[PDB]
């Protein structure tokens with residue numbers, strides 16, 4: 337199995353044409369703020385293959 | 386003027402350069418009071434849940450459903466949506482909803498998913514790969530599990546074939562694994578397809594009872610009737626704004642009207658199919674719409690050869706909302722519009738640069 | 752509990768003239784003192800309307816129904832195609848207090864009647880989908896217009912106090928929208944419901960066709976006059 341290949345899964349907004357984003361930060365899916373701490377409704381946006 | 390005329394010199398006259406219009410300030414959206422909420426309370430707060438092979442099926446149509454409160458609930462262990470994102474579910478909607486509620490094991494929660502196999506996935510309930518909807522699972526060890534064993538809940542274990550998507554099997558026929566016939570009595574090659582659950586308070590996470598509800602959405606050609614409430618806001622008046630009255634969009638200034646709608650219309654148009662009056666869905670009063678002002682601008686100059694000062698005329702615009710030429714010098718209001726830059730006198734001469742309504746300007750100052 | 756009767760309710764199927772009746776508001780737009788031309792389904796002027804004094808009749812595009820009601824004898828209507836559990840069926844009944852509308856695979860008998868000593872004209876009621884309850888619809892003239900377009904059932908109604916004896920009066924009265932149903936059915940036939948106790952029903956039925964009309968709106972937005980363009984050359 338290969339796990340070096342990861343792709344984005346969540347974003348605040350859509351990407352502009354020819355745009356690059358490499359930031360890896362917790363996503364606040366729910367109304368509850370994660371405050372930089374992973375938990376309920378808080379996920380890592382990078383998912384592997 | 387030089388840019389529009391494409392020259393570095395300008396002769397005496399009046400020229401029309403560009404237009405002018407009032408920009409909208411804010412936006413307002415109005416909608417009815419919102420009622421007839423979908424009865425999700427009696428499903429997710431039901432006292433009892435049926436077995437996995439006897440999953441309760443419920444039809445949801447002709448109501449409004451607020452998924453925000455369901456999403457924000459932190460008491461649910463698993464909340465998996467595949468077809469669409471839960472956040473955007475409040476906008477799009479379908480014509481009907483099917484709810485399938487039951488209780489399973491903690492370790493069998495991932496059996497009910499597209500591209501998944503298992504005892505439940507092949508003998509009790511099957512989900513198609515192309516399934517769209519959501520699944521909500523939460524522990525029920527404190528309630529469903531019994532000290533003496535919650536043997537009322539059972540599950541299908543034996544069947545010759547698997548289960549089709551959205552198919553329920555409740556047959557109690559004695560399964561015959563072998564070729565030995567049985568006259569309704571289980572033997573060497575005959576076993577009962579159903580097995581009882583043995584939940585106990587001290588069993589461990591993964592074998593505990595878990596209540597699972599699966600919501601599926603279908604979009605038959607009949608019009609959609611179930612989805613999220615339409616948020617509204619307050620309204621303003623005497624200000625050119627853009628509005629979205631019950632799906633009717635347009636820009637303008639809203640005032641109080643003396644028209645009397647007959648009790649079933651929603652809006653009115655005068656002629657050439659232009660809306661003039663509306664009725665707000667909440668207060669049920671008639672409002673009048675006027676397009677906020679616009680008009681052209683013109684410049685009066687005595688010629689580049691002579692001087693370099695000019696005057697500006699806004700055509701058909703009241704001298705109340707003009708806006709560096711906002712205040713400037715003395716401002717005159719004429720039947721032709723508003724004029725800034727020139728001075729009004731009491732004499733009367735021949736007409737040099739026509740303006741309109743019987744008045745015109747000339748260069749002495751202008 | 753439904754059984755066939757002995758006598759045949761052969762109401763005489765007479766014909767009479769429509770005159771200038773059967774005009775309804777086409778939309779929910781307010782217009783003041785203006786002439787507006789619109790093309791839609793209407794009942795042609797001076798048409799041939801059938802008079803019954805309880806057969807099954809086709810639905811076609813739409814139906815205009817008129818009742819010279821005396822003391823509320825008519826009670827409801829049935830809509831459908833196969834009139835059994837094989838296909839969805841619609842039922843509307845205005846009882847003493849409310850109106851009830853149901854969409855189910857009913858199992859009607861061969862002769863419906865409401866009966867008095869609520870609903871017992873169907874042996875079974877299976878696969879019910881849509882239910883609705885509201886205020887009652889009803890020496891008076893009761894005029895109704897029923898249309899079914901793209902999964903929407905439109906019902907328009909009007910009540911009039913009349914003193915004329917038998918046929919429709921000469922006059923003008925627009926029909927206001929009453930009820931809308933967001934349900935998709937392909938109705939082709941319909942039937943009338945009478946609450947005849949076990950121990951003489953005059954009404955009028957007409958059909959609709961697509962054509963263009965000219966309507967006049969007064970200062971207050973009420974339709975006061977109309978002209979049928981597909982008529983004598985002066986009207987055109």
Ligand SMILES: *[C@@H]1O[C@H](CO)[C@@H](O[C@@H]2O[C@H](CO)[C@@H](O)[C@H](O)[C@H]2NC(C)=O)[C@H](O)[C@H]1NC(C)=O
Pocket residue numbers: 425426427429430454
């Ligand atoms: C089941 O009942 C509970 C108990 O009332 C509901 O939880 C309430 O949810 C509302 C939603 O905002 C809160 O304001 C209350 O404070 C909650 N009550 C408690 C005691 O926490 C729950 O929403 C119900 N489940 C449904 C309706 O699906």
Ligand SMILES: *[C@@H]1O[C@H](CO)[C@@H](O[C@@H]2O[C@H](CO)[C@@H](O)[C@H](O)[C@H]2NC(C)=O)[C@H](O)[C@H]1NC(C)=O
Pocket residue numbers: 418666667668669
């Ligand atoms: C929609 O809801 C509003 C909010 O209640 C209703 O406005 C009320 O109208 C009554 C009528 O006199 C007033 O006494 C209340 O004070 C109003 N409420 C508020 C908050 O001011 C309105 O009538 C409703 N309209 C419909 C069509 O349901």
Ligand SMILES: *[C@@H]1O[C@H](CO)[C@@H](O[C@@H]2O[C@H](CO)[C@@H](O)[C@H](O)[C@H]2NC(C)=O)[C@H](O)[C@H]1NC(C)=O
Pocket residue numbers: 703704705
């Ligand atoms: C420009 O707007 C002002 C204010 O909106 C107008 O002044 C009003 O004129 C009417 C008609 O004489 C009076 O009844 C109001 O009392 C005036 N309002 C104020 C605040 O003075 C003015 O008439 C408009 N300009 C033109 C050319 O009509």
Ligand SMILES: *[C@@H]1O[C@H](CO)[C@@H](O[C@@H]2O[C@H](CO)[C@@H](O)[C@H](O)[C@H]2NC(C)=O)[C@H](O)[C@H]1NC(C)=O
Pocket residue numbers: 846847848849850851869884
């Ligand atoms: C007339 O129709 C109304 C509307 O259906 C009837 O009222 C309902 O009666 C049923 C009978 O079991 C009740 O379950 C409902 O709760 C009633 N609804 C309302 C809003 O009252 C009424 O009983 C009917 N009356 C007659 C004489 O047939």
Ligand SMILES: *[C@@H]1O[C@H](CO)[C@@H](O[C@@H]2O[C@H](CO)[C@@H](O)[C@H](O)[C@H]2NC(C)=O)[C@H](O)[C@H]1NC(C)=O
Pocket residue numbers: 481603605836837838839856878880
């Ligand atoms: C009983 O009702 C169900 C749904 O209420 C019907 O199922 C629908 O059948 C139609 C027929 O082609 C399908 O197009 C739909 O996709 C089905 N599901 C729906 C509408 O959710 C069922 O056909 C009805 N039974 C009978 C005998 O009419």
Ligand SMILES: *[C@@H]1O[C@H](CO)[C@@H](O[C@@H]2O[C@H](CO)[C@@H](O)[C@H](O)[C@H]2NC(C)=O)[C@H](O)[C@H]1NC(C)=O
Pocket residue numbers: 970971
């Ligand atoms: C149309 O609306 C006007 C405006 O209300 C009606 O005129 C009123 O009529 C009533 C009785 O006929 C009088 O008591 C009022 O004094 C009238 N109002 C005014 C301002 O004069 C009129 O009746 C309505 N109908 C028609 C056909 O014009």
Ligand SMILES: *[C@@H]1O[C@H](CO)[C@@H](O)[C@H](O)[C@H]1NC(C)=O
Pocket residue numbers: 690691
């Ligand atoms: C205006 O034009 C005349 C001739 O066209 C010229 O003699 C005069 O100098 C000009 N005025 C200026 C340049 O200020």
Ligand SMILES: *[C@@H]1O[C@H](CO)[C@@H](O)[C@H](O)[C@H]1NC(C)=O
Pocket residue numbers: 729730731
């Ligand atoms: C002169 O014009 C001004 C305004 O430009 C006016 O107020 C004043 O009354 C006028 N005087 C005479 C004598 O016409």
Ligand SMILES: *[C@@H]1O[C@H](CO)[C@@H](O)[C@H](O)[C@H]1NC(C)=O
Pocket residue numbers: 766767768798799
């Ligand atoms: C209505 O139809 C009947 C029989 O079809 C006919 O006798 C009568 O003249 C018709 N009336 C008209 C066309 O006005």
Ligand SMILES: *[C@@H]1O[C@H](CO)[C@@H](O)[C@H](O)[C@H]1NC(C)=O
Pocket residue numbers: 935936937
């Ligand atoms: C009604 O029947 C016709 C032909 O049988 C079919 O084409 C149509 O889709 C049907 N409509 C509904 C709503 O069942």
